[PDB]
Amino acid sequence: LYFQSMKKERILAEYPDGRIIMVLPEDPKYALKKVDEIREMVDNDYSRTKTLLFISNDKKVVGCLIAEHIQWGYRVIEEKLPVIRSEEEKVRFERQKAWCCSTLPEPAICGISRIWVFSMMRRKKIASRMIECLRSNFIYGSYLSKEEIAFSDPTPDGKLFATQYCGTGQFLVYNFING
Amino acid sequence: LYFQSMKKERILAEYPDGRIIMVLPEDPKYALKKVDEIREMVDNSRTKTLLFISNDKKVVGCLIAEHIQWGYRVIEEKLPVIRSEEEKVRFERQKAWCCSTLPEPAICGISRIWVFSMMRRKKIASRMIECLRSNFIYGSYLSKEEIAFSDPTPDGKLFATQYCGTGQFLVYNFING
Numbered sequence: 008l009y010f011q012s013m014k015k016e017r018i019l020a021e022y023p024d025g026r027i028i029m030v031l032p033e034d035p036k037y038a039l040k041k042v043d044e045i046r047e048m049v050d051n052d053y054s055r056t057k058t059l060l061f062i063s064n065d066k067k068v069v070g071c072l073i074a075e076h077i078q079w080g081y082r083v084i085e086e087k088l089p090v091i092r093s094e095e096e097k098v099r100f101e102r103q104k105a106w107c108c109s110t111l112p113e114p115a116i117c118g119i120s121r122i123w124v125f126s127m128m129r130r131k132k133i134a135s136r137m138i139e140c141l142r143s144n145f146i147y148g149s150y151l152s153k154e155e156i157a158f159s160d161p162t163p164d165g166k167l168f169a170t171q172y173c174g175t176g177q178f179l180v181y182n183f184i185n186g
Numbered sequence: 187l188y189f190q191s192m193k194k195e196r197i198l199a200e201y202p203d204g205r206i207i208m209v210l211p212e213d214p215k216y217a218l219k220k221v222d223e224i225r226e227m228v229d230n231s232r233t234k235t236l237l238f239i240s241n242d243k244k245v246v247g248c249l250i251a252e253h254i255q256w257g258y259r260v261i262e263e264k265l266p267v268i269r270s271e272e273e274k275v276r277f278e279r280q281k282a283w284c285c286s287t288l289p290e291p292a293i294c295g296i297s298r299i300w301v302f303s304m305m306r307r308k309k310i311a312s313r314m315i316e317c318l319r320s321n322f323i324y325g326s327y328l329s330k331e332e333i334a335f336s337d338p339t340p341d342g343k344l345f346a347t348q349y350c351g352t353g354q355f356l357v358y359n360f361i362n363g
């Protein structure tokens with residue numbers, strides 16, 4: 008139940024249901040303390056980072072995405088494994104999902120260190136729109152590809168989000184099992 | 187750089203290079219204060235904490251265990267891939283570690299496991315896990331198949347694959363739960 012008030016603000020996007028503002032390290036102390044508390048609050052589930060925030064019309068902070076510079080990520084790949092049975096049993100074509108993290112470091116630009124959305128405003132495209140803004144705004148004048156972003160230490164929510172967001176059952180990660 | 191003092195502790199094994207003791211939720215207030223300070227630096231109720239203390243009196247390893255019902259299998263594979271080098275293509279295999287979505291029953295969750303950096307590769311983590319197997323459920327000796335590891339790090343992955351013997355191991359608080 009945390010709120011946030013302008014003192015300027017810097018809007019990257021406006022919508023029927025709210026706004027996405029960005030906050031940078033150079034911003035007033037008032038902004039830096041709020042990202043902090045929001046950080047702390049999100050942790051229940053610094054240097055050249057950028058923080059995105061989705062603010063409901065209410066002024067309530069309902070989205071947060073913290074992003075950092077990186078050089079490398081590791082691909083996670085959706086596989087669906089065949090279940091083979093004994094020759095005396097009947098055959099079924101149900102596959103079992105598995106998620107495979109490649110050990111090969113592939114090139115990357117933008118590491119999503121944190122990405123959170125308030126439990127009861129989920130599946131409303133908030134996280135998608137935040138990344139969409141991260142992409143247009145991580146580098147001034149560039150539109151990052153889906154592959155230049157990696158997600159730090161995916162939770163299962165993150166996995167299911169990332170996969171659908173990027174298409175093709177793949178996404179890059181870091182702070183994970185291969186590095 | 188924490189030191190534990192010999193008191194009358196619950197000692198699970200003695201070794202030439204030190205000992206392993208255990209701290210339970212309802213222990214004396216000293217014990218639980220010490221475990222908490224070991225918790226913090228490591229990270230730079232229904233649980234059990236195992237400490238490896240060297241003859242030097244130093245806290246050299248920490249193992250925090252936990253009850254659980256479910257784990258997910260992680261296994262190394264070589265995935266068919268295409269290597270593309272400006273127009274030119276070849277077929278190859280990429281090493282990857284695969285986590286199955288299938289829940290499997292597990293009893294004991296290694297929520298933390300840690301050995302002080304200078305003391306690694308001296309079988310301290312292996313031993314902590316041995317003390318754990320024969321001190322988790324009374325009158326019972328845990329199978330490797332009944333142990334799972336919380337959110338493994340790359341170090342923990344390299345340890346578990348070898349410690350578990352099969353090239354496979356179970357996890358939780360990971361990408362599938």
Ligand SMILES: CC(=O)SCCNC(=O)CCNC(=O)[C@H](O)C(C)(C)COP(=O)(O)OP(=O)(O)OC[C@H]1O[C@@H](n2cnc3c(N)ncnc32)[C@H](O)[C@@H]1OP(=O)(O)O
Nearest residue numbers: 122123124129130131132133134135159162164165168171
């Ligand atoms: C921190 C990291 O780097 S990764 C971990 C991310 N942080 C967390 O896990 C904290 C708790 N969870 C969350 O905050 C949220 O679940 C997030 C950030 C992962 C997703 O937030 P949302 O705003 O609900 O995602 P969004 O609406 O943009 O998702 C769009 C699509 O992604 C997929 N998706 C997102 N979350 C889920 C889910 N929990 N289960 C299944 N599919 C999902 C769906 O296809 C969804 O489309 P649909 O609703 O039309 O069927």
Ligand SMILES: CC(=O)SCCNC(=O)CCNC(=O)[C@H](O)C(C)(C)COP(=O)(O)OP(=O)(O)OC[C@H]1O[C@@H](n2cnc3c(N)ncnc32)[C@H](O)[C@@H]1OP(=O)(O)O
Nearest residue numbers: 300301306307308309310311312336339341342344345348
């Ligand atoms: C929180 C969790 O649940 S998982 C995360 C585990 N903890 C951490 O990541 C903290 C940092 N790392 C660690 O503290 C340690 O490396 C631990 C706890 C993973 C292992 O501690 P150790 O006492 O060095 O393990 P141990 O000595 O019993 O290793 C036995 C075998 O596992 C394998 N192994 C253990 N560490 C490694 C490694 N870093 N690289 C490659 N193989 C390894 C080796 O085969 C080793 O046998 P060997 O030395 O004869 O070749």
